[PDB]
């Protein structure tokens, strides 16, 4: 028995709504700024579940049972008696502080405020609030990845970290406590990997398929690092590298100028059909250095 | 085809099985003492008897593998070798005079390759009469499918192709690398371990947590702290210091935490304590 | 001598007492609102009444000090000023147009000085008709004996000497500085605080311990963590980021720990919590 | 009631011997490699105490009472039933590992092994030993400075840190626990100060007396940073900077090339009569830039 | 061919000279304030007068090229070269304001020093290319030809031919910060400034060192004053911000001098004070 | 004056030429293997022959200077210039072995590229000074005069006069890593190598870029091959180790080529392969 409000209806918010609604006994309020943005979010969840039922990987009764626990709307209307708030709205500081300042008046006092952000300070987002702000960081696709990073901020009490811990296990996830530093644990290790694999390309050491092949056969990684960057989106890798550099001031985390030149040109990876690989119609991918 | 493997230690052992696994090849497993090489082949043959009893290899395929390997001294066994893969102690002067000696023994068409991970292929073969290429296996060499082929600054393109063709002819996937510090795998993978240690050092997360986050967040088979324990923190410290010294770039500065643990003998699995304590059962316990 | 002090805040207050303390000087304490400047002088006069009751100043020396200071607007009080010390909000465009306005008011021989710590003296006075020098007091300006005199890239040697002579004429010790980021004191002293924080961040010692070690090991009056609390961690973060941005050098990267505490409002004494909790008695407690 | 053996009879060892022998109830074995090196150490302690009695700052009975508790000799002869060993021998790794490997056989099992080193790893010094090695770091003059840094190594148990804690209070010092990192607490903060004050000189920002005057009047420090470097010895500042750089790999701790050029020329500060200041006969010091 | 130059400063003026001195080309010269865009064409006749006087040019040739330059015109050019201020939104906006104004099929080229070509041309209808001239653009034989990720080869090659058509040498260079010449030459100026700042030598010694020790036509500090110390700071900063590498941090002595307006030859005081005698004096005497 | 040069390589040979070509000086040329120290004087007559053939020198002048050079002699010189290998203990030992051999009052000078002068002369009886020539020492007009902390002015000035006496220009420079010219010029070669390594351009383009874009007599990569890529690596490494600043990290492509013995003109293959035709080919074609 839990009510969960999810502020943001793009990719992350829809997956976070699905992660709670998969557990029987949870109802999800899928909110956004315009009521029609939330409705497009719930239709996107529905459309996506129609594909799996087709590909035979989920039963239609389950899909229906998931969709039935999600309600689109506005936070003023749906988040009063919410037990947990998980925001996955746009990565802008002032938008977050506004959202949470409103919800602070809307929500009952018992409500837990959490943010899925990966680029901003949990500490600075929840500064003015009347209650603890915590980080509850999901990984795309949030309904299938079992990791949750629980980020403590400078003032986030330990009970608040402990509660998000219990909730993550309740929904079948594995929490990992992180004290707020840029990149947390997973992003701080993983994106500098992608960045090194790009320096190795830029410096002429090896080719794209070779760097990826070496990482797949040499370390038993599921993808190559450059494959992976296309699939994450090179724009997001660049932004994480730049966040890792600006927070620390450490030249160690400088982004590879090759990534920046591709993002400038719009070659963001799988989402643009072209990054280090070209994604064609016939389901084949070829590295851009051929 | 006849291959000479210089070094009867673990790597040399694994490289000899890789070539002897394949029908039609012969391997001379050499080391600096006739006995060393004969102990190398005895470790190989008993690893094969555990496999036979485990039922995962025919008793006659294993015998035919052991039969294809001959221990001895290079002065006796490598003159009509077609390919030499060196896998001996990582010291630049020991590798240079081993390849100086082999330059006089081995027939001209014999190809010279070194399994080195941390020394410069180019420097290795500076003064020789024939090209020197990198042929960097991954342990266990008989089981890992990747082979990094390292072109030196004067290693002709023809030499690099023929080592590619040999790697596939023994069932590997060659990835051509133009020599730089760390090649591909080590240059990505060891700074990874190093970063997880800085995360531990700086109080961001705990050892178990850093490792759980990378396997459940990034789909990695091992956490980076378990893996640096499995590779050996001494191997990880040394690769970091190579990257640092070959580049000049503070980016590759090793994490002082790893340097403190290596100074105390806490190297990982090989000493029974690193980031994890490895107990008498099978569990491992984070020192956290 | 007649001095104009631009800014009736704490620094401007402390700089006006420094000049009015000395017999024969007059000070115009100006700010952008007539009331602000009159509140500045009222804070000054009541600080002097606590001193009189504490018996540490004659009742007539204090009255004569307060009498030498006149609040108002610069357009009214600074035209026949001999020296202008600006001490207003640290924003480059606010300082440039304040000195543009004063360039038309003040008689030509009036000397223009700014108390800025983080902005470029040279940029401050780029387009003016007269030189612009740094005259950087230390709070409390009336009590600290040091004055850093900052030569700009176009500040003549004659201007620098005359500010030296004024500093001693009001009983200070001038230390000539050729403009660079941090001058002398801030460039040594704030990286100090920053380093003690990295030591805390990296788990080397504890907050009380870092502070006790520096006072009993180096003969320092305050620990560096107490001192960053007393200066304000926001002031310390900002100086770090100036040093970093003016140099380009990772050496002066601020410690992320200090950046996290500033984002949470834990700035030190001014907010009642930083590295120390400051309780209702007089004790302070390390957040450690 | 405590017996203390001090391995090293130069400056540090003599001051460490004096710090324990000042406390009634402690007897000090002042050891070195050649019996005559320890005797010169005890005569140096005696000569130095004859000066204070002259300058009127200590009573002669006290000096005599201190000297009487110090015995020069060889560790084989004097350190068997020692309660604590504090080595302040030369800063060389192999010398330390040899000294401690011998003392490990000499000393009773109850004996605490400690090292005053400031440049080497406590962890690497006591690796092969049969008992914990700890760092007990004194500050010249060890008999008058109240700070002791107690350094835990990678394997130094907490009881061993706790015991050196009690002993430091017993002798009137204030211990500070430090987990082993280069420079500990005091040196990592202080010498990079001296180094910055030297960059400021080298870059032409201010003059020698001005940098020192600013630091004395601006921060209320007892000395200027350049004054202080002369008094510490610029060779030692250089070595600490170089140790801080090599251990971290961080360009942040690069030594100022001005310090290195003065050390090369032999201008080590007060001990050579010339560093940033020239130390004349008539008790006056003038900065070398005049 | 018709050619429009955007910017009327040293480089704008020199790029205009470079096109108009080849028989057959016509140039449109432009700037913000028109009085500055005629001040441009004014500095062009003034210099051609001093050379015809010195016998280096025939008056009729000097008069044939200053008649091919029109201060404005851009509606009909076959090629646009912007030599505007080295600020990114400054270049997007101009080029933004410019995709309307020019004929549909006319080539857009920027003379930027180190900025990404690819970001410069993002909202445009047509490919954007890099065509980099070197001070003085009318004498220096080099053109660096920089193509962005979305720059076709027909345009890269159409620039190579135009280059050889006006007596230049076009070297093609891939898009990275500083391209070739500035990435090498500007840190060299920056280093010489650190050498003066740390007192290793004086301004005079460093410059004659590199002239007599390296056979360089200018010392690195005279060369900074001639380039403009504000352009040098910019490129250093762009170098530093593109790579993230403290290797390229500008020398604080150059940031101090740009803040004071000691920019070199354009303001009469850089590392040298330039006198009417035509003699320059190092500011450290 | 009598002059002894220590080292018989390019710089040793050129420094010998620089003294002997001035009427009145005599030089003693030296090296490890004597066959190398006559190989030195062999490369000196061979080059003077090719110039007399090309009419640049009169045979009698070529014959007057090769008669002032004696392969050895050092016992009586008034001035010693070492141009030995750029390894510190290599220079201390030589100079160590040399304070005995030379006359008591003779001036000791090192042609080191970046090493501290002050540490070079520590155990010596006499001041040690820096007298830095530039390849080719007989043409390049510059001498950098470097004094150590314990080098008196009489010796610094005695070098300045000797310099002007052999038609050079002596610039005095304070002891820091790289002095002036190499601290600027060598990272410039190093940068051009990073530019080739990151693929921004090819070897040819970078060099003609800097010739046509900067008016440089050699491109930075030809200049590396002419200096020797082993000397360039050394100076970069010394730069990096003296400052501690990753700004000066050598480019790994130059460390790889030195490891392979691709040193430039002295080994026939650097960034260019040098052919008997007298044409050089970039190794990337
Ligand atoms: C920052 C960026 O983005 C790109 C950049 O700009 S980086 C900087 C690139 N530019 C440079 O580095 C400049 C390098 N410096 C040089 O090449 C030389 O300094 C230099 C060519 C400018 C030297 O000046 P110079 O040789 O005296 O001028 P130059 O025109 O070549 O020859 C001088 C002659 O102008 C000659 N001349 C003949 N015709 C001429 C003409 N049409 N126009 C001008 N001059 C002419 C005359 O012969 C005059 O010499 P005399 O008085 O002795 O007769
Ligand atoms: C690393 C360190 O520690 C210090 C260093 O060395 S750093 C590197 C410093 N050195 C440099 O940078 C070199 C810079 N490069 C240059 O200055 C030019 O490359 C260069 C002078 C070498 C160009 O070569 P050049 O101009 O062709 O040779 P140069 O001798 O000056 O003139 C060529 C002429 O030799 C001339 N010549 C006349 N007399 C001569 C003589 N006594 N000796 C030699 N050449 C003579 C001839 O005129 C020949 O030219 P022609 O065939 O056209 O008639």
Residue numbers in the entry:
A (entry chain C), D (entry chain C): 0 to 289
B (entry chain A), C (entry chain A): 1 to 288
E (entry chain B), F (entry chain B): 1 to 72, 77 to 289
How did the manuscript describe this experimental structure?
The A2HBD has elevated expression in F. prausnitzii A2-165 and is crucial for the transformation of acetoacetyl-CoA to 3-hydroxybutyryl-CoA in the butyrate cycle. The monomeric structure of A2HBD consists of two domains, N-terminal and C-terminal, with cofactor binding occurring at the N-terminal domain, while the C-terminal domain facilitates dimerization.
Additionally, X-ray data of A2HBD in complex with acetoacetyl-CoA at a resolution of 1.9 Å were collected at PAL-XFEL (fourth generation) utilizing Serial Femtosecond Crystallography (SFX). Due to the limited resolution of the electron density map in the adenine moiety of acetoacetyl-CoA obtained from the tertiary structure analysis, a detailed examination of the binding mode between the adenine moiety of the substrate and the enzyme was conducted using fourth-generation PAL-XFEL diffraction data. Arg143 (NH1) forms a hydrogen bond with O30 of the substrate within a 3.00 Å distance. Notably, residue R143 plays a critical role in capturing the adenine phosphate ring, underlining its significance in substrate recognition and catalytic activity.
